[PDB]
Amino acid sequence: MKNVGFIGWRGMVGSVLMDRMSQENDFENLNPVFFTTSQLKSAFDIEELKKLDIIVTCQGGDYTNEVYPKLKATGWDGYWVDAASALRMKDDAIIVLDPVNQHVISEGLKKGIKTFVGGNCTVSLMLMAIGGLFEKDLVEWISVATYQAASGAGAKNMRELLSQMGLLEQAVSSELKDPASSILDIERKVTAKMRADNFPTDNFGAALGGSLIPWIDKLLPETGQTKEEWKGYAETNKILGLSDNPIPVDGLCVRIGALRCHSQAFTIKLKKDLPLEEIEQIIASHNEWVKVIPNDKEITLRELTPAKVTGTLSVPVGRLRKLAMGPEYLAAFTVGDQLLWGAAEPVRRILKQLVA
Amino acid sequence: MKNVGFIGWRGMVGSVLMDRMSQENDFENLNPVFFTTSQLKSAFDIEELKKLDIIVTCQGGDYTNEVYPKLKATGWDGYWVDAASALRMKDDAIIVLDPVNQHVISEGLKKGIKTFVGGNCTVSLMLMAIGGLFEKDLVEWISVATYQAASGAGAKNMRELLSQMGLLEQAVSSELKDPASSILDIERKVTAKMRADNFPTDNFGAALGGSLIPWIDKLLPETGQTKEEWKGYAETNKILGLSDNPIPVDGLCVRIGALRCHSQAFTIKLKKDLPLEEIEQIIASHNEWVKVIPNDKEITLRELTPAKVTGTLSVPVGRLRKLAMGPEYLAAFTVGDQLLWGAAEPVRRILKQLVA
Numbered sequence: 001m002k003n004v005g006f007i008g009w010r011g012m013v014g015s016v017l018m019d020r021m022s023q024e025n026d027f028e029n030l031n032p033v034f035f036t037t038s039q040l041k042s043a044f045d046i047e048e049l050k051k052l053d054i055i056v057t058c059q060g061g062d063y064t065n066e067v068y069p070k071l072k073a074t075g076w077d078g079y080w081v082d083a084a085s086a087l088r089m090k091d092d093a094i095i096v097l098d099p100v101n102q103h104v105i106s107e108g109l110k111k112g113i114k115t116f117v118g119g120n121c122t123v124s125l126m127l128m129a130i131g132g133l134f135e136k137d138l139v140e141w142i143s144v145a146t147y148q149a150a151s152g153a154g155a156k157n158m159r160e161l162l163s164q165m166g167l168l169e170q171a172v173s174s175e176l177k178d179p180a181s182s183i184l185d186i187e188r189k190v191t192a193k194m195r196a197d198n199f200p201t202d203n204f205g206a207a208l209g210g211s212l213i214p215w216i217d218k219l220l221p222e223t224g225q226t227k228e229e230w231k232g233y234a235e236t237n238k239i240l241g242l243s244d245n246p247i248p249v250d251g252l253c254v255r256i257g258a259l260r261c262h263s264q265a266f267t268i269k270l271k272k273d274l275p276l277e278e279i280e281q282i283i284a285s286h287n288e289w290v291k292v293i294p295n296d297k298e299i300t301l302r303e304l305t306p307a308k309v310t311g312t313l314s315v316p317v318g319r320l321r322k323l324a325m326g327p328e329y330l331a332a333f334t335v336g337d338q339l340l341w342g343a344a345e346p347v348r349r350i351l352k353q354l355v356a
Numbered sequence: 357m358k359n360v361g362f363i364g365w366r367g368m369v370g371s372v373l374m375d376r377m378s379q380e381n382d383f384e385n386l387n388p389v390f391f392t393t394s395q396l397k398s399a400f401d402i403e404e405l406k407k408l409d410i411i412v413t414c415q416g417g418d419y420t421n422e423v424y425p426k427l428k429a430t431g432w433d434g435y436w437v438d439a440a441s442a443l444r445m446k447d448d449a450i451i452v453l454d455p456v457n458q459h460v461i462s463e464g465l466k467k468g469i470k471t472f473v474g475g476n477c478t479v480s481l482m483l484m485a486i487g488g489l490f491e492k493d494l495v496e497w498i499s500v501a502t503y504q505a506a507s508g509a510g511a512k513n514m515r516e517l518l519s520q521m522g523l524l525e526q527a528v529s530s531e532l533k534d535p536a537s538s539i540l541d542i543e544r545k546v547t548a549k550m551r552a553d554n555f556p557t558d559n560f561g562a563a564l565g566g567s568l569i570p571w572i573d574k575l576l577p578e579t580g581q582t583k584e585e586w587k588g589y590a591e592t593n594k595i596l597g598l599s600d601n602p603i604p605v606d607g608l609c610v611r612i613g614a615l616r617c618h619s620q621a622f623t624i625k626l627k628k629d630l631p632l633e634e635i636e637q638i639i640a641s642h643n644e645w646v647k648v649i650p651n652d653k654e655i656t657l658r659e660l661t662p663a664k665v666t667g668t669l670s671v672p673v674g675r676l677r678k679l680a681m682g683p684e685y686l687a688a689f690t691v692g693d694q695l696l697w698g699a700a701e702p703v704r705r706i707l708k709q710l711v712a
Contacts, residue, residue: 162532176515186515205657223677250680251623265607265608331607
């Protein structure tokens with residue numbers, strides 16, 4: 001059994017990984033060594049890390065940027081599996097999403113790649129839903145509008161969102177309890193609360209509960225995209241292995257008041273005209289997690305929502321139909337859990353492949 | 357002075373209208389006669405209505421389809437101003453948004469048009485934001501992704517939303533106050549509450565607070581769009597007077613946890629390659645309400661949100677940049693109040709013109 005070191009296993013993402021691994025009994029297929037940054041082995045002890053065959057870290061980019069270089073320099077030839085974005089774009093690093101790019105991964109191992117990094121949550125969740133179309137070579141480009149959850153920003157962000165929602169209701173607790181109060185008076189109070197100085201907004205820098213934030217991460221002055229939107233085009237193509245002939249994936253990344261699921265509205269420009277039924281089949285057949293949701297109201301309300309998807313490995317995709325722009329224009333909406341396929345799952349899966 | 361009858365002036369939309377008219381002292385330029393359905397004239401007394409010059413109704417579609425044809429039959433020669441969607445697509449009716457279609461309105465008045473209806477909130481808020489691009493005949497098509505407020509659905513929906521948010525927080529109130537509590541334990545509890553049978557979801561048919569619903573109104577079998585999405589193509593063009601040579605407008609209408617502001621993500625295909633700076637100038641110049649928000653984080657966070665725009669007549673538009681598909685592909689995000697330009701304001705304005 002391979003000796004695997006775990007770093008950052010107590011963080012939010014790291015905790016989801018430990019749970020999923022335990023749930024699947026992955027620990028009986030490997031020898032785990034747990035590291036810590038607290039003053040268990042020290043996550044900063046290069047000598048100890050070099051004894052390992054594989055290192056799985058959910059610690060973050062700063063840690064990776066500090067330790068990874070030192071360890072590689074020792075001559076260490078083991079595998080580094082990372083959830084952080086730090087090494088995704090390195091030429092000696094492969095972004096993993098095995099249900100989608102198992103071939104890229106297989107060839108990469110054969111090539112001697114020793115670094116595998118999970119991809120951006122929005123991109124991996126998109127590929128898990130729409131992967132069938134890319135596999136059949138049908139996508140020319142994709143216009144994206146996201147509805148991203150707080151978990152992407154962090155645990156304290158999730159907490160702030162919950163606190164905000166609580167205070168908004170509290171502002172009109174009395175008014176709401178009597179069925180005949182003025183709804184406009186109620187919103188004046190809620191909105192006044194949202195704009196108040198004591199309204200907790202330090203994590204987001206703006207209210208999220210009862211609102212939305214059309215900006216995620218930093219701006220890349222050169223394109224005008226935020227880093228989050230930039231990863232859609234950059235990461236989608238590196239994952240699929242189309243960096244030299246990249247497929248345009250761009251849009252706006254917006255944060256909404258949800259906890260763990262990212263939702264995305266798509267305008268997909270296909271290369272050819274196909275029957276809707278054929279398109280649906282191509283999508284549903286790609287993997288066992290995607291779930292095609294019929295374009296029906298009651299079914300959509302029950303299946304295509306964060307309420308339904310949270311904490312599950314299911315990737316529903318629905319509202320599938322042709323758009324007014326042309327028969328080659330397809331509309332689609334998907335919902336997926338940010339902490340699972342968007343974070344811990346690709347890492348848990350590549351790990352299982354490395355220790356088999 | 358013109359004798360104007362008001363119906364539904366006590367409902368949410370009618371109340372905004374009444375408040376706005378008071379704020380602008382519109383009642384000084386007309387003789388108001390208020391109607392009621394309670395057992396002040398009766399909203400159903402066709403003889404009373406027939407004595408007025410204009411009828412302004414925010415009562416709703418069922419009322420209009422009941423009384424309107426019956427009053428028109430008495431030979432009534434006055435004007436019918438409606439906030440409901442019932443008559444929007446009638447050939448003897450014009451959808452009003454004067455800052456955008458004053459010419460269509462003016463021509464219609466001279467022609468003898470007697471029925472003026474406010475337009476769909478999403479289409480109106482969209483045109484108030486990028487009306488400059490249509491004005492310049494620069495739009496080839498537009499794919500839309502909306503983040504719609506509860507107010508669009510109704511007053512009780514706003515209340516359900518606020519109540520859902522309160523419950524979600526109350527389910528983890530003590531844990532949230534504990535700075536060392538597990539975020540995963542907190543989410544597990546919030547999510548359980550959201551799925552509880554007793555979670556108030558009768559108005560939306562699903563959870564909205566902490567989630568989203570990618571479906572608004574009824575399905576339109578013919579195209580697969582919901583009626584809300586269908587209005588994009590139908591109403592955008594009727595408002596602009598382009599029903600004979602339609603511009604494609606389509607996308608996905610999604611409901612989120614906001615009280616009264618609709619937000620929209622746009623992918624706009626322009627007819628020519630224009631510098632971004634030029635495009636912003638074209639957008640900012642169309643009307644006095646649209647506000648171009650520079651593509652900067654801090655300004656965007658403070659200006660382009662429901663939190664900022666709620667209850668105001670401002671229609672900010674930002675995140676403007678060229679998309680990866682090409683220099684003729686424009687990204688844009690806007691936020692607008694659903695009850696003002698989306699409902700009462702276009703009605704308030706056409707009435708001012710009718711009583712001049």
